[PDB]
Design an enzyme around this catalytic site. Structure first.
Site, PDB file in Angstrom:
ATOM      1  N   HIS A  84       0.865  -1.178   0.000  1.00  0.00           N
ATOM      2  CA  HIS A  84       0.000   0.000   0.000  1.00  0.00           C
ATOM      3  C   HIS A  84       0.898   1.222   0.000  1.00  0.00           C
ATOM      4  O   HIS A  84       2.114   1.118  -0.037  1.00  0.00           O
ATOM      5  CB  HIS A  84      -1.094  -0.019   1.086  1.00  0.00           C
ATOM      6  CG  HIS A  84      -0.612   0.063   2.492  1.00  0.00           C
ATOM      7  ND1 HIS A  84      -0.302  -1.049   3.248  1.00  0.00           N
ATOM      8  CD2 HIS A  84      -0.504   1.117   3.318  1.00  0.00           C
ATOM      9  CE1 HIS A  84       0.018  -0.667   4.470  1.00  0.00           C
ATOM     10  NE2 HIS A  84      -0.097   0.646   4.550  1.00  0.00           N
ATOM     11  N   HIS A  86       1.503   3.741   2.174  1.00  0.00           N
ATOM     12  CA  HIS A  86       2.105   4.372   3.325  1.00  0.00           C
ATOM     13  C   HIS A  86       3.615   4.163   3.366  1.00  0.00           C
ATOM     14  O   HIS A  86       4.177   3.310   2.704  1.00  0.00           O
ATOM     15  CB  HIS A  86       1.462   3.857   4.612  1.00  0.00           C
ATOM     16  CG  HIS A  86       0.058   4.310   4.811  1.00  0.00           C
ATOM     17  ND1 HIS A  86      -0.834   3.630   5.608  1.00  0.00           N
ATOM     18  CD2 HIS A  86      -0.593   5.429   4.419  1.00  0.00           C
ATOM     19  CE1 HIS A  86      -1.989   4.257   5.641  1.00  0.00           C
ATOM     20  NE2 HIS A  86      -1.864   5.373   4.947  1.00  0.00           N
ATOM     21  N   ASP A  88       5.650   2.929   5.501  1.00  0.00           N
ATOM     22  CA  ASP A  88       6.195   1.644   5.923  1.00  0.00           C
ATOM     23  C   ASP A  88       6.166   0.622   4.804  1.00  0.00           C
ATOM     24  O   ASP A  88       6.628  -0.512   5.004  1.00  0.00           O
ATOM     25  CB  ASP A  88       5.534   1.110   7.212  1.00  0.00           C
ATOM     26  CG  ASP A  88       4.087   0.756   7.073  1.00  0.00           C
ATOM     27  OD1 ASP A  88       3.390   1.403   6.293  1.00  0.00           O
ATOM     28  OD2 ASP A  88       3.567  -0.032   7.920  1.00  0.00           O
ATOM     29  N   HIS A 148      -7.390  -1.657   5.834  1.00  0.00           N
ATOM     30  CA  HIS A 148      -6.493  -0.659   6.384  1.00  0.00           C
ATOM     31  C   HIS A 148      -6.377   0.563   5.471  1.00  0.00           C
ATOM     32  O   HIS A 148      -6.219   1.684   5.941  1.00  0.00           O
ATOM     33  CB  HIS A 148      -5.134  -1.327   6.614  1.00  0.00           C
ATOM     34  CG  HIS A 148      -4.059  -0.358   6.935  1.00  0.00           C
ATOM     35  ND1 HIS A 148      -3.888   0.166   8.193  1.00  0.00           N
ATOM     36  CD2 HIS A 148      -3.107   0.206   6.155  1.00  0.00           C
ATOM     37  CE1 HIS A 148      -2.889   1.016   8.184  1.00  0.00           C
ATOM     38  NE2 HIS A 148      -2.409   1.057   6.956  1.00  0.00           N
ATOM     39  N   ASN A 179      -3.391   2.440  12.946  1.00  0.00           N
ATOM     40  CA  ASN A 179      -3.571   3.730  12.288  1.00  0.00           C
ATOM     41  C   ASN A 179      -4.730   3.609  11.309  1.00  0.00           C
ATOM     42  O   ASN A 179      -4.598   2.978  10.256  1.00  0.00           O
ATOM     43  CB  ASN A 179      -2.300   4.152  11.557  1.00  0.00           C
ATOM     44  CG  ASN A 179      -2.508   5.407  10.742  1.00  0.00           C
ATOM     45  OD1 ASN A 179      -3.331   6.255  11.090  1.00  0.00           O
ATOM     46  ND2 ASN A 179      -1.795   5.516   9.623  1.00  0.00           N
TER      47      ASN A 179
HETATM   48  N1  LIG Z   1       0.963   1.332   7.875  1.00  0.00           N
HETATM   49  S1  LIG Z   1       0.773   2.637   8.840  1.00  0.00           S
HETATM   50  O1  LIG Z   1      -0.592   3.012   8.934  1.00  0.00           O
HETATM   51  O2  LIG Z   1       1.693   3.664   8.513  1.00  0.00           O
HETATM   52  N2  LIG Z   1       1.180   2.174  10.433  1.00  0.00           N
HETATM   53  C1  LIG Z   1       2.200   2.734  11.205  1.00  0.00           C
HETATM   54  C2  LIG Z   1       2.083   2.302  12.495  1.00  0.00           C
HETATM   55  C3  LIG Z   1       0.960   1.417  12.551  1.00  0.00           C
HETATM   56  C4  LIG Z   1       0.468   0.799  13.811  1.00  0.00           C
HETATM   57  C5  LIG Z   1       0.340  -0.580  13.916  1.00  0.00           C
HETATM   58  C6  LIG Z   1      -0.175  -1.161  15.066  1.00  0.00           C
HETATM   59  C7  LIG Z   1      -0.545  -0.340  16.090  1.00  0.00           C
HETATM   60  F1  LIG Z   1      -1.044  -0.907  17.228  1.00  0.00           F
HETATM   61  C8  LIG Z   1      -0.437   1.020  16.037  1.00  0.00           C
HETATM   62  C9  LIG Z   1       0.077   1.591  14.881  1.00  0.00           C
HETATM   63  C10 LIG Z   1       0.427   1.325  11.274  1.00  0.00           C
HETATM   64  C11 LIG Z   1      -0.730   0.480  10.871  1.00  0.00           C
HETATM   65  O3  LIG Z   1      -1.759   0.467  11.555  1.00  0.00           O
HETATM   66  O4  LIG Z   1      -0.579  -0.239   9.774  1.00  0.00           O
HETATM   67 ZN   LIG Z   2      -0.552   1.731   6.390  1.00  0.00          ZN
HETATM   68 ZN   LIG Z   3       1.169  -0.410   8.718  1.00  0.00          ZN
END
Ligand SMILES: NS(=O)(=O)n1ccc(-c2ccc(F)cc2)c1C(=O)O
Ligand SMILES: [Zn+2]
Ligand SMILES: [Zn+2]
Length: 231
Positions: A84, A86, A88, A148, A179
């Protein structure tokens, strides 16, 4: 020996974890909005080359990833797919492209350009409708629908029954949907149900962040997203 965790990886090195024959995850950590998070990607052996799934969340981390791959595996990374838009997933694409790696993402993953993120070079057609699947070297790419993010892809390694869920799949210890800024909480359970239906024989399921497990990560994800939405 154990799967490496957020407080075990300083921001800037990368660890690899053997998942199956010819399949590794990569684990890095990065700071975002003032908190440090681990993040996973995948490495899949492709004959005498490697296919990379997702960057290690930033230019420096991704350089460290390439160095760790050379130390631990010693085969060249020739292609990468970002699952995706983002950081990361695409942050580090410029490093990869300068290291000889051909970088790929769906055309929807337009979103990176609009956000100001790094942009994979090549477009992966054939993934624009939920349930679509295409073969890419030793993996299958699957678009499950919005979760997501609207563009999130899933990756399956048929030789090893390894399901890499990316950020559409959460680890078992998760208590929240992570997120959700770009998420579709209404469609996410439907998308997860599509993954469950398509890959009933998955033996390992790898979340976007945190510890791999089995198929229960899929239902757990649906549960925590439904609970987040409901709430
Ligand atoms: N892919 S993302 O949006 O940039 N990303 C960065 C950090 C997090 C994250 C993961 C687990 C959590 F418990 C808290 C945060 C995410 C995510 O939810 O994929
Ligand atoms: Zn993400
Ligand atoms: Zn992520």
């Amino acid at each position: 020996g154990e799967y490496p965790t957020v407080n075990e990886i300083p921001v800037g090195e990368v660890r690899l974890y053997q998942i199956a024959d010819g399949v590794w995850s990569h684990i890095a950590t990065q700071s975002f909005d003032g908190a440090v998070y681990p993040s996973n990607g995948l490495i899949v052996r492709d004959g005498d080359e490697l296919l990379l799934i997702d960057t290690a969340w930033g230019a420096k981390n991704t350089a460290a990833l390439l160095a760790e791959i050379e130390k631990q595996i010693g085969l060249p990374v020739t292609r990468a797919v970002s699952t995706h838009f983002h950081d990361d997933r695409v942050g580090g694409v410029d490093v990869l492209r300068a290291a000889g790696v051909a970088t790929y993402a769906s055309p929807s993953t337009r979103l990176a350009e609009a956000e100001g993120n790094e942009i994979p070079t090549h477009s992966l057609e054939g993934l624009s409708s939920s349930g679509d699947a295409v073969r890419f070297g030793p993996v299958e790419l699957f678009y499950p629908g919005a979760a997501h993010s609207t563009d999130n892809l899933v990756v399956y390694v048929p030789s090893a029954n390894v399901l890499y869920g990316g950020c559409a799949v959460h680890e078992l210890s998760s208590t929240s949907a992570g997120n959700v800024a770009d998420a579709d909480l209404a469609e996410w359970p439907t998308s997860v149900e599509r993954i469950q239906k398509h890959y009933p024989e998955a033996e390992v399921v790898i979340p976007g962040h945190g510890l791999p497990g089995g198929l229960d990560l899929l239902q757990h994800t649906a549960n925590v997203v439904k609970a987040h939405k409901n709430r």
